[PDB]
Amino acid sequence: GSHSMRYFDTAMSRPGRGEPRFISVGYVDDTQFVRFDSDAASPREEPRAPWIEQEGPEYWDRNTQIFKTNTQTDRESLRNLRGYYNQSEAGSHTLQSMYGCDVGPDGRLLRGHNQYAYDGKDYIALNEDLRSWTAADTAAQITQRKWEAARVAEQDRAYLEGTCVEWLRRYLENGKDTLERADPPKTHVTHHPISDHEATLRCWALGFYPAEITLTWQRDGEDQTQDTELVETRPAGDRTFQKWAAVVVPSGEEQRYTCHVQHEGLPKPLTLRWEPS
Amino acid sequence: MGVAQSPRYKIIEKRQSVAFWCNPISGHATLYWYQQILGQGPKLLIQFQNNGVVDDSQLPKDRFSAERLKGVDSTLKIQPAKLEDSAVYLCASSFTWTSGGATDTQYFGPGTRLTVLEDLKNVFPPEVAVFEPSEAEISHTQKATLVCLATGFYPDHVELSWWVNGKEVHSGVCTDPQPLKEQPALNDSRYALSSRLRVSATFWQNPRNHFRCQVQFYGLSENDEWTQDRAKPVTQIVSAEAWGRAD
Amino acid sequence: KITQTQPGMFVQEKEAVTLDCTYDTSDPSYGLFWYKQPSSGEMIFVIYQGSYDQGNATEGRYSLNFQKARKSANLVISASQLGDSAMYFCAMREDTGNQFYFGTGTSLTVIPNIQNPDPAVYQLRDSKSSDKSVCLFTDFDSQTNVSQSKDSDVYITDKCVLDMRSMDFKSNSAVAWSNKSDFACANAFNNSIIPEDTFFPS
């Protein structure tokens, strides 16, 4: 259907410990397809998807070049950043970048992203129009000025409208069997006696893809939320996801409680109850 | 601005070294060095992103090198030069190199023409003569063609230009694209080059009009050693002149 | 891989030209660039096409006839001037690649529409110094080709286009010279196919 390609990049300085840590992992939707990491981590035994492997060694050498090249920029970035914030050389600092493109069902661009954070706080973002920046603070304004003078938004718009889109299509074609699947959640509700008085009902959704899901408990149809204890959607580890929703119910009153799943790979939003098997 | 380069021409003896300087468009983060052999298109030597190398896979191992110390100003060096290095060395700058858009486009400099000779003793300055227009040409077509002949120069490092009354003249001019081997037998053969300035009959017949033919020769420098009987063939302007003829 | 075949290419003035260029990429995204190189070989950038941009690329008199399926990016120069020669280079930038791949280059000579040929071979007397004597075969038409001499000590140049801009006049010209005593302007171009109506003044 519709898809997103996103890259998540990191540069963490490590004064007195070694050279900065440079990471760059790419996703199509919720599927990691490519990872670059200055910390090597195995003889190029680096989490590549099968449909990237089919791309030549030229693709791989070139992306590696861009990575090494990017680290170089990011070192300059780190240096300038601590100048802007008057921070000593002694501290460790993190630069992060997040970028990529959202395509529609017709493989054309819906939205382009490109934003930065310094020490886990937003720093600068390419606006939706891909022609302007929002600076989070005074320091980022120096970056913004520097970048409007150097026409960076234009360079980024070019990547987002051109290379990003075009390659995302190439990826989606080559990995259709993986990337176009939508695995519905396998669900069930379990009973967990707390006392004679009370019991936890737990509504489970396992094995789903993509990660986007909605797990809600309801009473007779009337919604909870304040009493529903969600857990954070979590990786199964087989490129699939899990989430559960729990609620505490007085004993005897189980049938009054309904679980409502809603997921992309589910033909119609489903209802579940407890059922003593 | 524009991509600046120095020098324009250089003559080196085989085995000597050269430096080439290049100054990118102000603020261009990417800087490329190319070699252009006669008959070919430019082929990338090395590419710089700010002060760091992007690709140098095509930098001739251990004769060629390049720095861009501060990601601005850049320098290409050849230590032991071979004759095969005779070529034009173009540098170019761009904003980016993998944007995949217009900011990738490379703007080149004027280039440096390097000629690597076996022996510098084969370098000669041009001798230049102006030839006054034929009388018949005046009384037939009502316009006068002066012909300039720059002769006996080597290597092909010359730029011929016409000067009418202290003004370099754009138009009514014709310089050969290619010189002529004055003795096709010899390998290092001296060169000839002709040029035409056609003005109106009126303009030529006025004797207060000054026609000067100028050849800029780029040869050796003060630092080049030289042991021949003739004077060192330095970069110089050899020129011939003529006044208008009433007749 | 760029392939611009044709050794050279000719065109009339004010006419339009197509310089062929077929590339070989396999990449989903790439760019194509045209560059011209006049005498005094500066590389001037003329036109850019991204494999993904919608309408074909246009820049002044330059136009890129980009055909993705046939993988060709011919440069279209319209309303050609004399200052359009110039060797022309086709270059491809492909995401996967590590450089602008330049073609071998096609040279384009622009022939002027010579507007009233009065072929003449004049004899230019010296200004002073130089044991030579210069013959100028001039004002001839574009149909005639100048051959360099078959004799050792006689140098003949090549047709060169004068542009008198100011007076709209354009003139083909060729020069010959020698030191040898048996050289007159009469027999100077006896190796060339000169027009039957070529003026020969004494």
């Binding site: 760059s24 992306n63 990017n70 920029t73 930065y116 970056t143 520097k146 360079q155 | 992103q49 904003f95 | -």
Partner: peptide
């Protein structure tokens, strides 16, 4: 396909 960063913050 990775993006190129030619200009630092």
């Amino acid at each position: 396909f990775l993006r190129g960063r030619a200009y630092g913050l």
